Amino acid sequence: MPLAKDLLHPSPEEEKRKHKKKRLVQSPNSYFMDVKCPGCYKITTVFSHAQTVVLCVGCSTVLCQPTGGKARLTEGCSFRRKQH
Amino acid sequence: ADWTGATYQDKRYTNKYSSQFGGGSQYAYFHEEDETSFQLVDTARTQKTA
Amino acid sequence: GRMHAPGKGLSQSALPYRRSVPTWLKLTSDDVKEQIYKLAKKGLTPSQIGVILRDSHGVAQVRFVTGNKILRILKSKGLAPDLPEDLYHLIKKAVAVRKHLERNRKDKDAKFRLILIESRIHRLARYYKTKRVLPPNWKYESSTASALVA
Amino acid sequence: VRMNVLADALKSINNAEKRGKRQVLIRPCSKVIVRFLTVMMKHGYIGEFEIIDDHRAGKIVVNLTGRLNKCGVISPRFDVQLKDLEKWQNNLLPSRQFGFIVLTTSAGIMDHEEARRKHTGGKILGFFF
Amino acid sequence: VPLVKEKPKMFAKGTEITHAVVIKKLNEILQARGKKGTDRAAQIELLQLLVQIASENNLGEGVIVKIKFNIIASLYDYNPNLATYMKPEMWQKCLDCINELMDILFANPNIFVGENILEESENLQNVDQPLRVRGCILTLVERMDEEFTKIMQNTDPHSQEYVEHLKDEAQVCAIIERVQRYLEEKGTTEEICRVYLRRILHTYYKFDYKAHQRQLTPPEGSSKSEQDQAENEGEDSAVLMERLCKYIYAKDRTDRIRTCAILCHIYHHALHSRWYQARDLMLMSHLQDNIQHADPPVQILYNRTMVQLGICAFRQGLTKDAHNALLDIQSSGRAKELLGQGLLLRSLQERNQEQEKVERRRQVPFHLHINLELLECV
Amino acid sequence: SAKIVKPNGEKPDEFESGISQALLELEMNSDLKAQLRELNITAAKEIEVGGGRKAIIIFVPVPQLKSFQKIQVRLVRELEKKFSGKHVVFIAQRRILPKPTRKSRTKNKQKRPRSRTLTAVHDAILEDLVFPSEIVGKRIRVKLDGSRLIKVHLDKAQQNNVEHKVETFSGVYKKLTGKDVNFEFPEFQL
């Protein structure tokens, strides 16, 4: 520490690269996403850390896979946040 | 059908295929899904020669 | 930190300040309710219920599209279980330990760990039973453990 | 745990002032800490302070100067009856001339100098000088 | 010694095989589906062995239909990447399981099958009520066509293997016909319009050599067999196309299925030299103004239909109208991409790898290509 | 009606009656009636600013407040021109309670809910004034004179919806509470 540093107003990601409950306001580090690949032609919305298999109603019947954190998607783009 | 919008940029050709009755929408397909949200997750080590 | 291990750790969920909808969403309060009631039929318990909504459906959480929690919605029907799943999962574990202990009397490590999980039941029971969520005559024993988990 | 919130609070601003700082971060924000620091601000030992808001309990940030030497807590909270007062303030202050024992009374939270003019005893919280 | 090595017996020796125990075991296996750590080969084998046990005990055909649906759905889930094709050994077993499912379902007209039946409405046991089985043959056959399309996007166009996988197209066409007849008797109008689109999609590009052979032999005078006449009453691809398209135009609630049907209808008229019909349908549609806002696969179908209209005008000696229809497509220098037949190597340097991976999935199979050298020569 | 659409607020009053008449008239008119459904107010009020301009206030029964939030911009746009020269904002009215722990006498009547408490109402009022920004942060500063100034960090989208209302919203809150507020747009958005 330079022992005089500001703490009222932090840098956009040089003082918001910190742990999420050590920030001034607590934010998640997760997001939603609007998908719609071909294997299942429907506008699905899915959480980033899936935690469970997300099913498909088309020819496919799998979209995700829950790993140790985020979730590995598949061969279908479909991406957004949106906003959060 | 030009998905790139490049073929008809010349103002001389903009009206070349306009119908005399105004193009009706009864056979027009409207995509309701916002394709701006679909990102192909390239698990990004794909490479090409310099 | 930990209540029967020496450890300390952070992994807690952190909610946003906001709490609108937010805007993008559907299934009015009422839609969410019938979506839930179907799941509880299938043996999906309140913790599982919120997960299976959050992962694949448009909710952030079912506390900002309803004025109630997931459990209170089920309770108003009368379709809530007679003991909390929290208590159930403790008792569910300790029976298998006691089976393994009868099959192997030289697993002193298992015997040790049973003392912890056993005492952790009694502490939890003394929360509910003072709050009039359990009968004031109910106790935990081998016999009552067997019958109540089945 | 964090049995007493106010007691953990003052040690930060005490430690911080010694090293040479002028901004701090104190949590988790009790109303009791606010009215304490209000009285401590009037006399002039600290500057204006900003209360950040969270739903959890909030966080508070303070701007301070070298005028402060030390603020301590006294716990557990004893009673005073305006004849016990003189005995307390002798032990806890560097001088009669300045230093301020704080306390809470039914007439609100205030210094000892004010309480003597209202004829109100009460429960003692901390001190500073 | 430890008992070895009978495959782990699904039931203990002494559990009575009741319908409720089989459904409970099916739901245990189905709750294992898609989990990060389950074997998918074992999930298919465990469902096939549950069919054998269901057929040994005649536990109600509604259960047999429900487990056959879960087998076909687990065969699609065998590949965890929606963007890769199915392996031939698993593809054949999928076509077999779909035929056996259709055989059981044609034997039993009393069974109702659909998406619109909630799991709480599953009459699997009551003979005095219509059996109601939650499973949609349509979305499985729509998925079969998606897996077939991916095989024919990932085999090399010049290898003998392409001709081998194209033999299975006849079995796909037959399954879609079996499912059409079944949904004409029992289906909703929104399921019928979707099967009619799938039947149109495998017929609109095929030139009817039987209709042409029937035009090249006028019936002057040789007498053989009334049996050879009943197999000659094969309904013309043109009359079938006109019936299915008119039903879509009169019953469809979606502007998408209508838009695909009119483009396939125009393509089929244009392929058969029927220029006036193809022209008048194209002009009546006003798609020229509206297609810019339609999805890119429908734009690729429109561009292929516009090339086919230009080739149809050329076959009729209408060189001026042929030139006009082909001018914008060929003068673009991007004809291969506009027709969905590949990417141009000169544009590989300017695109994001994720967009390229989405454009590759939008390519039409090689047996749906129109030769670019034929297009440029015309 | 046009006079008895303001109960618990005193039915006669010239300005308040002249609002109600042409307000319900718009709702009855066929020009928009496919999102206007014959709601009523409960009072109204006109309050100035130090900007030298007036602004009108619309109270509602508050279960009906939710329906107003549906349209809220189109409606306010039309009434910005129809009542022109003044700013227009919706707000809600609550029946705030003294404490039983003692600011007025209790009789063990009921518990006193903590949504019917004082402080929760003054938070809820702020949520409506700048509803289209959907408040991102709140901060407060305390003065040496014991005053308090309440910073509000707003979203960095939907800026111009509130940017010409930015000062005039602050003067509303002053009259209702007795407190001073400032509105800000932050450095960064997450």
From Swiss-Prot, chain A:
This is Small ribosomal subunit protein eS27. It comes from Oryctolagus cuniculus. GO terms for cellular component: cytosolic ribosome; cytosolic small ribosomal subunit; nucleolus; postsynaptic density; small-subunit processome. Binds 1 zinc ion per subunit. InterPro entries: Ribosomal_eS27 (IPR000592), Ribosomal_eS27_Zn-bd_dom_sf (IPR023407), Ribosomal_zn-bd (IPR011332). A zinc finger (C4-type) spans 37-59. One of its GO terms (biological process) is ribosomal small subunit biogenesis. Component of the small ribosomal subunit. The ribosome is a large ribonucleoprotein complex responsible for the synthesis of proteins in the cell. Required for proper rRNA processing and maturation of 18S rRNAs. Part of the small subunit (SSU) processome, first precursor of the small eukaryotic ribosomal subunit. Residues 1-16 have a biased composition (Basic and acidic residues). PROSITE patterns: RIBOSOMAL_S27E. Belongs to the eukaryotic ribosomal protein eS27 family. GO terms for molecular function: structural constituent of ribosome; zinc ion binding. Its main location: cytoplasm.
Swiss-Prot record, chain C:
There is a cross-link at residue 26 (Glycyl lysine isopeptide (Lys-Gly) (interchain with G-Cter in ubiquitin)). It is found in: Cytoplasm; Nucleus, Nucleolus. The modification Phosphotyrosine is found at residue 37. GO terms for molecular function: small ribosomal subunit rRNA binding; structural constituent of ribosome. Ubiquitinated at Lys-26 by RNF14 and RNF25 in response to ribosome collisions (ribosome stalling). Keywords: Acetylation, Cytoplasm, Isopeptide bond, Nucleus, Phosphoprotein, Ribonucleoprotein, Ribosomal protein, Ubl conjugation. SUPFAM superfamilies: S15/NS1 RNA-binding domain (SSF47060). The keyword ATP-binding does not apply. The modification N6-acetyllysine is found at residue 26. It holds the Pfam family Ribosomal_S15. The modification N6-succinyllysine is found at residues 26, 33. NCBIfam families: PRK08561.1. Component of the small ribosomal subunit. The ribosome is a large ribonucleoprotein complex responsible for the synthesis of proteins in the cell. Part of the small subunit (SSU) processome, first precursor of the small eukaryotic ribosomal subunit. During the assembly of the SSU processome in the nucleolus, many ribosome biogenesis factors, an RNA chaperone and ribosomal proteins associate with the nascent pre-rRNA and work in concert to generate RNA folding, modifications, rearrangements and cleavage as well as targeted degradation of pre-ribosomal RNA by the RNA exosome. Component of the small ribosomal subunit. Part of the small subunit (SSU) processome, composed of more than 70 proteins and the RNA chaperone small nucleolar RNA (snoRNA) U3. PANTHER family: RIBOSOMAL PROTEIN S15P/S13E, SMALL RIBOSOMAL SUBUNIT PROTEIN US15. This is Small ribosomal subunit protein uS15.
From Swiss-Prot, chain D:
Keywords: Cytoplasm, Nucleus, Ribonucleoprotein, Ribosomal protein. The modification N6-succinyllysine is found at residue 87. It is found in: Cytoplasm; Nucleus, Nucleolus. The keyword Cytoplasm applies. Coiled coil: none annotated. PROSITE patterns: RIBOSOMAL_S8. Pfam families: Ribosomal_S8 (PF00410). GO terms for cellular component: cytosolic ribosome; nucleolus; ribonucleoprotein complex. Component of the small ribosomal subunit. Part of the small subunit (SSU) processome, first precursor of the small eukaryotic ribosomal subunit. During the assembly of the SSU processome in the nucleolus, many ribosome biogenesis factors, an RNA chaperone and ribosomal proteins associate with the nascent pre-rRNA and work in concert to generate RNA folding, modifications, rearrangements and cleavage as well as targeted degradation of pre-ribosomal RNA by the RNA exosome. Required for proper erythropoiesis. Component of the 40S ribosomal subunit. Part of the small subunit (SSU) processome, composed of more than 70 proteins and the RNA chaperone small nucleolar RNA (snoRNA) U3. This is Small ribosomal subunit protein uS8.
Curated annotation (Swiss-Prot), chain F:
Phosphorylated by NEK6. Its main location: cytoplasm. There is a cross-link at residues 66, 70 (Glycyl lysine isopeptide (Lys-Gly) (interchain with G-Cter in SUMO2)). The keyword DNA-binding does not apply. The keyword ATP-binding does not apply. One of its GO terms (cellular component) is centrosome. PANTHER family: 40S RIBOSOMAL PROTEIN S7, SMALL RIBOSOMAL SUBUNIT PROTEIN ES7. This is Small ribosomal subunit protein eS7.
